Every structure is written in C-alpha cells, then in structure tokens.
C-alpha cells in the first residue's frame, strides 16, 4: 500500500505492506545487480537480496524469501522492494546499491507502528534572562510530542550553523518523541541578532518557525 | 550462513594513531571480503574490495589485508574526520553476510562541559506540562553525570537525555537532559537545579533558577 521513495521515511501499520523504490543510474551495462540491505539500531547489517534491472533476475536471502519481493519496471529503469505482513522487526533503514557508485543509495526508513501520526508542539529554550552572562549564551527549541520520526531543525533557514547542536530524538514513555536543538552565540548578539529555529515534521505536514529571545 | 566475527566492537583512537580492526570468517571465504565506512548521518562507503584493493579515491592510510578466514583493516595516521562505524562483508557464500561493526571514536584531551539550564516556557505550562532542560556543551570524554534537584530533592526516573555524535572538528560531545513534570508538580517547588559531574570538573557545576516570572 504505502509507497516509499529512496531517501524517504514512512509510517506503516503492522500487518500491512510497503514498497520501496530505487532508480537505476541509467548507464548501459550487461548486468546491473542492485542489492538491498537492512539496518537496525543495535543490530548488524543484513543482506536481503539482489535484482538485475536489465534481466529481472533475482536472488534472495532465505530469511527474507517470505517477506520481501524484488521487482523492476524496465521501462522506467526502477527497482522495487515490497515488504509484506509488516511487524516491528521490519522497522529499519533500508539501502539499495548500484554498481556504478561507491556509496550505497541514501537511506530509506520504515516505521511499523499502529500509533497515529501526531505533529509536535515547539517551545522556546530562552537565554538566561535577568542573569545573563557576558561570554557565550545558549538558546534553542524543544520539539515535543510527535510521531513518527523524523523531525528536522535548522536555524535561520540554514544561515546559522556554527555552534548548533541538534540532538537525537528521545522516545517518551507515552510513545511520542521529543527532540531538542540548541545553539551557542555571543551574549552580546542577544540584543540585535534574530535567532529562528525552523522545525519540520514531514509526516504530519507540520512546519514551524520560532524566534527565540531572552524572556522579559 | 557464514558468520563474520568483527573485533573490537568499540575503539577510541587519538589523532595520528593507528587503527587495527579484524574480521574472522567461520568458513574459508578466499579474498571475497569488502570493508565499509559509515560516517554519522551518512550511508556506508566502500573502502576495500576483494580483501586488499583500495576503491578509487580512498587514501593509502586505509589498508585491507588477509585471506582465507582472517582479515584486517588498518587505518594509519587517524584523522579527526575518520570517526565512524566500520564493517566487513564476505560475498563468497550466500547469503552475503556482514560483520557486527566497529565504532571508532576520536580520543582527545579532556574538555569540561559548559552548562546551561532552561526553565519551562509559559506556553508549555499553559498546556499542563513543564519540561526543564539542561545543556552540557562541547565536552570530552563522553561520560558525564547530570543530577536534577528540585528544592534539594534528587530526582530519578523523570528525566531523559541524548548525546550528539562526536564533533569532526574539535572531537567533543554535547548532551541535553530534560526533566519532565506536570504543571501542578512544577508549581509545588521553588529551586530547579542541574548538577553536572565530569572528569574535567574538579568540583561539580550546578546551574539553577527559581520558579517565577
Ligand atoms: C574496479 C572496481 O571493481 C569493483 C569495485 C568490484 O566490484 C565487485 C564484483 C565486488 O563488489 C564487492 C564490494 C561485493 O559486492 C557484492 C557481492 C555485495 O554487494 C553489497 C551488498 C553492496 O555492494 C555495493 C555495490 C558496494 O558499495 C559501493
């Protein structure tokens, strides 16, 4: 059901299916074996199988024979991997490989859960007010209660990169994620320079720009 | 299937030092072995193929060696940017299998964290919850302890923290800790403090604020 383009991230319900896509380079070769690899948090990489977009031939890891199906749309030179009867074990980052590239394809993420999509609430992490120092100050944004991952954060639309630290999300006992992003800047710039965190939670089509300043 | 046993699982190397990682195949795999490097937030990159061949562009610092069942990946003159996870693979027998990986961290001089505390926003409070955040910036080593105190009462079970990946330039880490309380509980105390303990701090550093405004 759910279609997942290379480099994307999609939430899928347990028991349902998902189909990932990966375009071939388009270069002419006799064979063009593309491999699919699975990567989980605290687990080693696992090879799923390979498919030749030119012939359509395939070869699977016995372990994934019943859950993965590799196909190819020769006309559009696109390879596909369908994962069926999804379980929490299928949540992971998947990569497709190409013979004419030393880097594997981006990283495509599947999240298998029945929890509904929920956009985050963004709150300011304001610089020390009334008791501000003179050296370096810190400010940020707390992106709370969202599902599923991921959430991205930029500062001043990418213009501000020095001193920025965007932390890995943390899964709360509620089942929702929270993420913090901070930036350190000269305590003297707090009176002139504007600092805006740009938050995006694509899964819920939620985008927020929040200006952060010392509270009065 | 054929199992590739990679060792060690974690390694801390100072810039300029040599890195030695090994992979042992449960059965003879000839020279059908490859080595990959995966940097934070990136996809794996092929470094070595057929046991000892460097992929075009890979510096001489990376050397793959071995045949049969014992393979080695050696990295000389370690650079701060070389931090990453390294994995081997055996493509001799199907299914193709990978080693468990080795996480290589950069070892540098100790750096004390710079601490900052953030009170909950009035906006969040209006929603019924209070998140208090403590930031520990640019420190090394990664080991650090954050103890939340509310009116001198030590908190436990109501905080979560996460750490950034090691900085490719200064080799430091940053950590953020969040103490979560209900608005009602938040309004039952006055002093909120974050006490930090770290190798680079002769005495713990505490940042705090009094609920108000
Ligand atoms: C001259 C260049 O010669 C080549 C790099 C040789 O490539 C070949 C046949 C061997 O490739 C090795 C790395 C193993 O490849 C297959 C069997 C396994 O594929 C894994 C899952 C992913 O490989 C990708 C394409 C390598 O990453 C880039």
Q: Are strands B70-75 and B19-25 parallel, antiparallel or unpaired?
A: antiparallel
- When computed from its CA atoms, the radius of gyration of chain B, rounded to whole angstroms, is 23
* Euclidean distance between the first and the last CA atom of chain B, given in angstroms as a whole number: 64
Residue A37 CB–ligand 1 contact under 6 Å = yes
Which residue puts its alpha carbon closest to atom 6 of ligand 1? Answer: B49
Q: What are phi and psi of A174, to 5 degrees?
A: -75, -15
Per-residue CA distances from B48 to A142, B62, B83, B181 (Å): 42, 8, 17, 51
Which residue puts its alpha carbon closest to atom 18 of ligand 1? Answer: B91
Chain B positions in Cβ-Cβ contact with residue A47 (cut-off 8 Å) = 95-98
Q: Which of A70, A67, A75 is nearest to A58 (CA)?
A: A70
Determine which of A107, A180, A181, A185 to mutate to test the interface with B (most B C-beta atoms within 10 Å).
A180
Chain A positions in Cβ-Cβ contact with residue B137 (cut-off 8 Å) = 138, 165, 182, 184
Residue A13: both structure tokens together: 């319900």
Which residue puts its alpha carbon closest to atom 24 of ligand 1? Answer: A97
Domains of chain A plus CATH, in order, are 1-114 (2.60.40.10), 115-214 (2.60.40.10)
B164 and A103 within 8 Å at the Cβ level: the answer is: no
Q: Check if the beta carbon of residue A1 is closer than 8 Å to that of residue A13.
A: no
Q: Check if the beta carbon of residue B186 is closer than 8 Å to that of residue B212.
A: no
- Cα separation, A118 vs A35, in Å, equals 34
Q: Count how many residues are written for chain B.
A: 213
Domains of chain B plus CATH, in order, are 1-108 (2.60.40.10), 109-213 (2.60.40.10)
Q: What are phi and psi of A117, to 5 degrees?
A: -70, 135
Q: Which residues pair with A21 in a beta bridge?
A: A80
* Euclidean distance between the first and the last CA atom of chain A, given in angstroms as a whole number: 51
Q: Which residues of B132-163 are buried (b: 16+ CB within 10 A; e: fewer)?
A: bbbbbbbbbbeebebbbbbeeeeeeeebebbb
**Data resolution in angstroms:** 1.8
Q: Which residues of B4-14 are buried (b: 16+ CB within 10 A; e: fewer)?
A: bebeeeebebe
User: Is the bond preceding B8 in cis, omega lying within 30 degrees of 0?
Assistant: yes
Per-residue CA distances from B10 to B6, B101, B104, B198 (Å): 10, 9, 6, 21
Q: Which residues of A89-99 are buried (b: 16+ CB within 10 A; e: fewer)?
A: ebbbbbbbbbe
């Amino acid at each position: 059901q759910v279609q997942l383009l290379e480099s994307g991230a999609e939430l899928v319900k347990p028991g349902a299916s998902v189909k990932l896509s990966c375009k071939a380079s388009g270069y002419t070769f006799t064979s063009y074996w593309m491999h699919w690899v699975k990567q989980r948090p605290g687990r080693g990489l696992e090879w799923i199988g390979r498919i030749d977009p030119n012939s359509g031939g395939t070869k699977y890891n016995e372990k994934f024979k019943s859950k993965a199906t590799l196909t190819v749309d020769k006309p559009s030179s696109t390879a596909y991997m369908q994962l069926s009867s999804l379980t929490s074990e299928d949540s992971a980052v998947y990569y497709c490989t190409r013979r004419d590239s030393d880097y594997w394809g981006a990283g495509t993420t599947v999240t298998v859960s029945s929890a509904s999509t929920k956009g985050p609430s963004v709150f300011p992490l304001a610089p020390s007010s009334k008791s501000t120092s003179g050296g370096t100050a810190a400010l940020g944004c707390l992106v709370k209660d969202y599902f599923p991952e991921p959430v991205t954060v930029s500062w001043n639309s990418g213009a501000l990169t020095s001193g920025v630290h965007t932390f890995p999300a943390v899964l709360q006992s509620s089942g929702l994620y929270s993420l913090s992003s901070v930036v350190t800047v000269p305590s003297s710039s707090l009176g002139t320079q504007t600092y805006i965190c740009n938050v995006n939670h694509k899964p819920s089509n939620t985008k927020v720009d929040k200006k952060i300043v010392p509270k009065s | 299937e054929l199992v590739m046993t990679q060792t060690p699982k974690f390694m801390s190397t100072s810039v300029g030092d040599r890195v030695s990682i090994t992979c042992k195949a449960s059965q003879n795999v000839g020279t059908a072995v490859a080595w990959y490097q995966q940097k934070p937030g990136q996809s794996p990159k092929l470094l070595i193929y057929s046991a000892s061949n460097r992929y075009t562009g890979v510096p001489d610092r990376f050397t793959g060696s071995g045949s049969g069942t014992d393979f080695t990946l050696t990295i000389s003159n370690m650079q701060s940017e070389d931090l990453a996870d390294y994995f081997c693979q055996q493509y001799s027998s199907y299914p193709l299998t990978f080693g468990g990986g080795t996480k290589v961290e950069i070892k540098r001089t100790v750096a004390a964290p710079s601490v900052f505390i953030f009170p909950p926003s009035d906006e969040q409070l209006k929603s019924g919850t209070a998140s208090v955040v403590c930031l520990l910036n640019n420190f090394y080593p990664r080991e650090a302890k954050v103890q939340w105190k509310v009116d001198n009462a030590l908190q436990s079970g109501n905080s979560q923290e996460s750490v950034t990946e090691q900085d490719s330039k200064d080799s430091t880490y940053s950590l953020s800790s969040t103490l979560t309380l209900s608005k009602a509980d938040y309004e039952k105390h006055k002093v909120y403090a974050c006490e930090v303990t770290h190798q680079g701090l002769s005495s713990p550093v505490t940042k705090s604020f009094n609920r108000n405004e």
